[PDB]
Amino acid sequence: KEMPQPKTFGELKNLPLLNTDKPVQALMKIADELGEIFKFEAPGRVTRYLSSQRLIKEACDESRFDKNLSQALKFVRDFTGDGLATSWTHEKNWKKAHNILLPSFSQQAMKGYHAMMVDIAVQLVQKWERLNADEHIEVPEDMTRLTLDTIGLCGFNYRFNSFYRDQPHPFITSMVRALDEAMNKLQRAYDENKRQFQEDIKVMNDLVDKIIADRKQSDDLLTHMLNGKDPETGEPLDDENIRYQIITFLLAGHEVTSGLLSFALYFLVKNPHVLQKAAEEAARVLVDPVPSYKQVKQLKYVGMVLNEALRLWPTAPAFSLYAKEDTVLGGEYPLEKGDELMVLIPQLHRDKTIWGDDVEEFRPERFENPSAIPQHAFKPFGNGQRACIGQQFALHEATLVLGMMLKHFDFEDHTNYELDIKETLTLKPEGFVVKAKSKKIPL
Amino acid sequence: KEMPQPKTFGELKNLPLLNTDKPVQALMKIADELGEIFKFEAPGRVTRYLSSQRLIKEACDESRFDKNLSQALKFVRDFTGDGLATSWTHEKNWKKAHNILLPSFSQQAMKGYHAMMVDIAVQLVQKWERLNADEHIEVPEDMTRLTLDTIGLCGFNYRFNSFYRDQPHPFITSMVRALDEAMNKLQRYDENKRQFQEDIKVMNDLVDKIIADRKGEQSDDLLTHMLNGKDPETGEPLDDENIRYQIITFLLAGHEVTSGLLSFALYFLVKNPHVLQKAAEEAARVLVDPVPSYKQVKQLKYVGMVLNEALRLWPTAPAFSLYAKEDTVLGGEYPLEKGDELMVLIPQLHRDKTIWGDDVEEFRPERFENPSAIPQHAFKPFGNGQRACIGQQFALHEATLVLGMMLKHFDFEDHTNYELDIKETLTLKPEGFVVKAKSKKIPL
Numbered sequence: 001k002e003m004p005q006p007k008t009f010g011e012l013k014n015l016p017l018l019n020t021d022k023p024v025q026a027l028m029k030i031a032d033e034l035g036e037i038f039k040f041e042a043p044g045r046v047t048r049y050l051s052s053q054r055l056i057k058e059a060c061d062e063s064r065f066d067k068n069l070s071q072a073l074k075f076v077r078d079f080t081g082d083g084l085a086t087s088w089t090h091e092k093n094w095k096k097a098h099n100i101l102l103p104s105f106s107q108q109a110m111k112g113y114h115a116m117m118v119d120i121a122v123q124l125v126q127k128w129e130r131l132n133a134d135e136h137i138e139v140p141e142d143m144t145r146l147t148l149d150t151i152g153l154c155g156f157n158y159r160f161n162s163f164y165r166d167q168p169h170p171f172i173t174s175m176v177r178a179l180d181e182a183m184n185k186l187q188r189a190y191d192e193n194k195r196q197f198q199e200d201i202k203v204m205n206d207l208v209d210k211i212i213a214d215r216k217q218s219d220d221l222l223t224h225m226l227n228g229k230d231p232e233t234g235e236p237l238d239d240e241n242i243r244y245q246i247i248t249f250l251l252a253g254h255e256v257t258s259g260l261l262s263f264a265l266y267f268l269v270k271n272p273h274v275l276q277k278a279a280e281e282a283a284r285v286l287v288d289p290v291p292s293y294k295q296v297k298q299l300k301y302v303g304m305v306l307n308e309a310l311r312l313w314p315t316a317p318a319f320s321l322y323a324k325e326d327t328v329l330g331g332e333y334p335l336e337k338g339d340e341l342m343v344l345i346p347q348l349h350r351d352k353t354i355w356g357d358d359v360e361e362f363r364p365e366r367f368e369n370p371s372a373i374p375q376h377a378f379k380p381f382g383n384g385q386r387a388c389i390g391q392q393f394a395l396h397e398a399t400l401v402l403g404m405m406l407k408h409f410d411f412e413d414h415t416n417y418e419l420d421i422k423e424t425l426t427l428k429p430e431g432f433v434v435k436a437k438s439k440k441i442p443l
Numbered sequence: 444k445e446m447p448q449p450k451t452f453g454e455l456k457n458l459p460l461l462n463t464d465k466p467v468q469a470l471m472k473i474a475d476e477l478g479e480i481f482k483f484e485a486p487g488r489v490t491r492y493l494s495s496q497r498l499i500k501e502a503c504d505e506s507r508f509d510k511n512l513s514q515a516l517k518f519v520r521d522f523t524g525d526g527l528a529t530s531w532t533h534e535k536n537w538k539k540a541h542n543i544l545l546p547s548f549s550q551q552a553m554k555g556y557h558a559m560m561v562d563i564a565v566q567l568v569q570k571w572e573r574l575n576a577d578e579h580i581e582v583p584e585d586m587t588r589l590t591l592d593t594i595g596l597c598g599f600n601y602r603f604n605s606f607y608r609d610q611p612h613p614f615i616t617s618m619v620r621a622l623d624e625a626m627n628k629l630q631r632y633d634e635n636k637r638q639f640q641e642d643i644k645v646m647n648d649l650v651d652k653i654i655a656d657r658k659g660e661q662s663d664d665l666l667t668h669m670l671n672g673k674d675p676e677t678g679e680p681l682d683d684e685n686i687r688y689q690i691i692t693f694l695l696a697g698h699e700v701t702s703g704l705l706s707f708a709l710y711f712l713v714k715n716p717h718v719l720q721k722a723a724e725e726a727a728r729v730l731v732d733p734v735p736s737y738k739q740v741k742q743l744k745y746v747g748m749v750l751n752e753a754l755r756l757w758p759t760a761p762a763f764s765l766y767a768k769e770d771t772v773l774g775g776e777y778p779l780e781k782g783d784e785l786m787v788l789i790p791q792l793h794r795d796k797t798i799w800g801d802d803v804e805e806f807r808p809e810r811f812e813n814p815s816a817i818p819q820h821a822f823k824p825f826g827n828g829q830r831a832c833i834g835q836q837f838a839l840h841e842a843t844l845v846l847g848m849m850l851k852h853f854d855f856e857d858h859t860n861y862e863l864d865i866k867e868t869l870t871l872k873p874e875g876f877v878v879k880a881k882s883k884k885i886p887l
């Protein structure tokens with residue numbers, strides 16, 4: 001009933017523990033020492049980090065706990081506003097935008113996005129086939145090039161043309177720089193850093209607002225938002241909220257999904273039996289020069305490989321909840337109304353009582369049957385009505401792209417890459433490089 | 444444009460296709476061959492059977508289509524009359540009864556019915572823990588005993604005492620024989636009519652007296668809400684004749700339709716042990732008191748998911764009927780004239796691979812984690828619109844309460860490795876489904 005807590009630093013309490021370049025991984029080390037739950041204090045803030053399925057399955061009770069904006073999300077809200085991802089459930093724009101946007105992220109809506117996703121994926125395939133001998137691939141960089149172009153085309157019919165560029169796009173320069181300024185505030189004479197954030201917000205907001213003005217009919221999210229009306233209230237999304245969704249989708253769509261692709265490829269080159277087994281599935285299912293939507297649904301082992309990458313290194317590694325009323329967590333940790341919880345997703349996915357002893361081994365076979373996994377044991381996309389609305393978009397693009405990659409190339413970990421996880425607000429394997437040898441199969 | 448139609452039998456057209464003991468299941472085999480729509484003609488009748496969400500989402504447009512009394516409901520109407528379920532939308536007693544009765548079927552109204560539901564549920568649990576070793580359970584029979592007793596107590600404070608009987612109640616004996624005669628007329632005798640009239644007189648005689656007997660006790664029951672309720676629209680209360688028709692309507696809906704859901708739910712749980720263990724863990728973690736509370740019953744989310752996925756595969760009221768208010772075009776390719784009839788084959792709707800993926804036949808309750816993700820009009824086990832099931836919250840509450848206690852108190856064993864056999868009356872039931880229950884010996 002007494003809750004553990006890591007080392008303290010006087011009046012700063014636990015905050016210097018976050019003054020590190022890899023905070024989620026440092027939080028994982030504490031959870032290994034302190035167990036399924038521990039209190040984390042800071043000046044003016046208190047939260048509790050959960051790491052066991054036993055406690056997280058109760059925190060996932062939507063009747064008792066609701067999504068809370070973590071300190072990181074409060075700072076991202078300064079440029080994503082009340083978009084879907086940084087709004088409170090009780091805000092009117094959340095439920096409104098949620099009802100308008102759900103049809104355009106469904107599994108049936110992916111049949112329309114499929115043609116645009118293949119468009120970007122073929123550019124990735126042709127880049128790797130046009131590499132010279134002994135040239136290598138910078139994996140997370142190309143994966144971000146792909147995920148960023150896919151959301152721009154399917155989201156607003158815009159071409160970032162990331163495969164024609166060495167330097168990133170002007171818009172994402174301020175977006176990435178705003179995210180860095182957002183994260184740095186958590187672990188913190190800072191007037192220049194603050195003035196720059198304001199300048200960067202003006203750049204994003206002005207650029208996106210013009211895209212809305214230019215459009216004001218194509219089968220993309222921007223059209224669905226300009227013409228859709230919420231069946232509940234009968235009102236459409238206003239223009240200010242629309243750019244908040246566009247900024248939210250552009251941020252979410254580019255690096256958290258590229259992270260999954262990079263982790264997936266890394267685990268496949270470190271476990272050649274699994275890669276071989278997934279390459280065989282790609283060859284027997286992708287029988288056309290261009291994959292179809294129906295073939296992508298048939299790449300089941302590719303789907304399990306992605307799920308097993310999400311288990312070990314979920315690229316959105318945590319989310320925050322608050323207690324709607326006074327309650328008791330697990331019959332031994334009483335909580336007051338408003339108290340905050342943090343679901344440390346990478347520790348949850350290592351609970352030995354759920355996954356057995358081989359928690360660190362990459363075996364996509366764990367996901368053969370979705371019914372054998374206990375409830376709330378696998379939460380890479382968040383939870384409940386506040387779960388990821390882009391989940392089916394992300395898994396379809398990742399399965400399609402990974403399938404073409406395994407079909408067209410043999411892969412080689414020529415540097416014996418030692419996993420180094422860079423942490424922003426998402427997770428990525430930094431410096432992960434491979435060589436791709438063509439299989440000389442036409443497109 | 445040209446609509447497919449099945450095999451014909453001369454001048455009888457397609458009617459001998461329904462001369463079978465499993466007509467809905469036979470219609471599903473036809474829908475698999477002919478696709479999303481097909482025409483079904485009989486002597487003096489034509490209807491069209493819809494099976495895809497694409498077409499059913501247009502048939503559920505209340506401004507174009509209204510509820511129609513199918514041939515099955517017309518024969519039920521001979522003893523349920525203009526009750527809520529067998530009246531036309533434009534009949535004055537529907538909108539009148541619908542406004543008086545909706546308050547007594549709301550989610551806030553289940554807080555009053557909960558105490559009586561637990562009363563019957565405890566009797567089911569105690570029957571099963573009092574079984575001897577190697578004794579088995581007859582699932583749909585016991586589920587029927589509970590659902591009939593729950594609606595009798597919550598509807599009119601009457602105890603059918605079904606757990607003290609081997610032979611069914613005298614009232615339901617005549618009702619069940621009336622439903623059998625109603626169904627037999629569809630695939631079709633002077634002797635049947637005499638008993639049918641005798642059977643109809645028995646139902647009117649018990650209920651007319653039960654209404655006459657109630658009149659001044661005030662109880663938290665439908666009968667009280669019907670004797671004192673006034674329609675805010677017209678300002679009138681329901682008269683005696685309509686009241687007995689609702690009671691018969693509720694008694695028929697309460698006993699067989701809801702117990703089918705429980706029996707199908709348990710059959711799917713014993714065939715998918717991973718789901719049952721997952722539902723048993725939730726039941727053990729939520730039902731912490733010897734008697735469940737109303738709020739603990741709202742917390743068994745996965746049990747609710749188990750019921751919903753049971754309703755998807757085998758919706759126990761497997762069809763409803765619509766007619767075109769005016770001339771319109773269905774799906775852009777099928778022209779329809781005002782008055783044309785449609786039939787929604789719910790089991791085929793719930794198997795549309797374009798909505799549920801390929802694994803439509805698999806029992807995965809995880810489809811219902813987020814109810815907003817499923818497209819519009821894709822899941823219609825309780826009908827559609829203002830003519831949708833008024834007892835939906837009442838059925839799910841009882842079924843969630845009862846399934847929760849069963850998963851809490853017993854382990855279940857499919858000792859005969861039961862091959863599913865679906866008996867068809869007007870509703871669906873797994874016939875002969877049996878299980879053994881080993882107690883977990885938790886007190887009540």
Ligand code: HEM
Pocket residue numbers: 067084085086098151248249250252253256257260314315316318319320380381382383385386387388389390391393394395
């Ligand atoms: C593999 C890639 C992805 C992962 C692991 C992921 C993960 C997550 C997680 C964990 C949350 C909940 C965070 C919280 O509870 O505060 C979330 C929410 C959200 N994600 Fe994703 N996401 C991915 C891709 C995407 C994509 C491609 C989009 C769309 C472009 C997207 C858009 C959103 C939105 C809008 C929300 C908030 C929805 C709401 O609150 O109603 N995500 N995601």
Ligand code: HEM
Pocket residue numbers: 510527528529541594692693694696697700701704758759760762763764823824825826827829830831832833834835837838839
């Ligand atoms: C899981 C169990 C149940 C299922 C699957 C179910 C299904 C349905 C369906 C499909 C309809 C519409 C039929 C049509 O369009 O002709 C309906 C209507 C109706 N149900 Fe249920 N039902 C269930 C339980 C109950 C219960 C327990 C009651 C109350 C005792 C009830 C009372 C009614 C009534 C009165 C109507 C007609 C309402 C109107 O037209 O205004 N049902 N139900």
Ligand SMILES: Cc1ccc(N)cc1
Pocket residue numbers: 085252253256316388
């Ligand atoms: C917190 C968060 C992380 C990733 C995504 N896509 C959405 C939200």
Ligand SMILES: Cc1ccc(N)cc1
Pocket residue numbers: 516528696697700760832
């Ligand atoms: C037609 C009909 C179907 C189900 C119920 N409960 C009542 C009537």
